[PDB]
Amino acid sequence: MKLDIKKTFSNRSDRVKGIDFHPTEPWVLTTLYSGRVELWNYETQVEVRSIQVTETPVRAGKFIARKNWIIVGSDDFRIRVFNYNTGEKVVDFEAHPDYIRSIAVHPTKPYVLSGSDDLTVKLWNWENNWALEQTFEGHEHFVMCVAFNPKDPSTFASGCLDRTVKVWSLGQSTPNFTLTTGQERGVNYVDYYPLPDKPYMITASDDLTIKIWDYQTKSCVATLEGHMSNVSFAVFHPTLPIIISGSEDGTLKIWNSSTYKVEKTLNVGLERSWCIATHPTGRKNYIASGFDNGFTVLSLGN
Amino acid sequence: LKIKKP
């Protein structure tokens, strides 16, 4: 394919651990290791807002555009919510007794999941004053990554350093199933293929491998070996037929999501790659990744 | 030492 990669916006900062696109404003949310979070207008190149939230790392950061919120999870155990128009803090609660690795936001329901080093995923309901509605117990190490099935968010997958993916149903305490990934350095990330033509999940590991999973057959479709150190993330782009992976090798790679052949290796020049966001509507097929030395927003051709 | 500190 012709990918026509364009550097939309680049910003140097502290290490970016979390990153997310606003769905209707030309904004990106970055969540930094210094305890700072930033909202950047990547079209105008103007900073919209920045907030010193704590002194510890803030690893997880999403928009909740329907409530004009940002939600952020930090190593100080806390989930914090801010109205991005005013800066007003909405809530600030101890979510786990250990580090918060990942936050996912339910698309239609007032539900947030947090993944943590306390070995659990916790479900929060903001229409019940952020009440803990369920604790998903069973994982054996740090829950690195939580992701709702975007085709059915009554279900979510949890990526863990116990080297399993677990797929759960909201309201059920036992997992639907457990993927034994054979990624012995653990699972850093898990994502779903969002289109209906394949029942696919993807994982990334410290073992330098990416693995494609069929949740119908519970088998490994493919192994993608194209990084020379820790693979931080691997995600299916929501429109283009590509996978984007990012590594502590400082590189972003674009794979053919059909043939699993490398389309492009991006040496972005900000050292270790930590996180990825894709624009939810696929506006300019926008992608962005967080790095040791800042973030970059990229637009992809049709 | 915290595992996955960075």
Author numbering:
A (entry chain AAA): 1 to 302
B (entry chain aaa): 194 to 199
Manuscript excerpt for this entry:
Wnt proteins are a conserved family of secreted glycoproteins that govern essential developmental, growth, and regenerative processes and are also involved in pathological conditions such as cancer. We defined a signal peptide region in Wnts required for secretion on EVs, termed exosome-binding peptide (EBP). Analysis of cocrystal structures, binding thermodynamics, and mutagenesis found that a dilysine motif mediates EBP binding to coatomer with a conserved function across the Wnt family.
The interaction involves two main contacts of the lysine side chains K253 and K255 with two acidic patches at the central opening of the β-propeller top face. In addition to the two primary contacts, a secondary contact involves the backbone carbonyl oxygen atoms K255, K256, and P257 of EBP, which interact with the guanidinium groups of R59 and R101 and the amino group of K17 in the WD repeat domain. Immunoblot data corroborated that disruption of the KIK motif reduces the secretion of Wnt7a on EVs. Best crystals were obtained in 0.1 M Hepes (pH 7.0) and 2.0 M AmSO4.
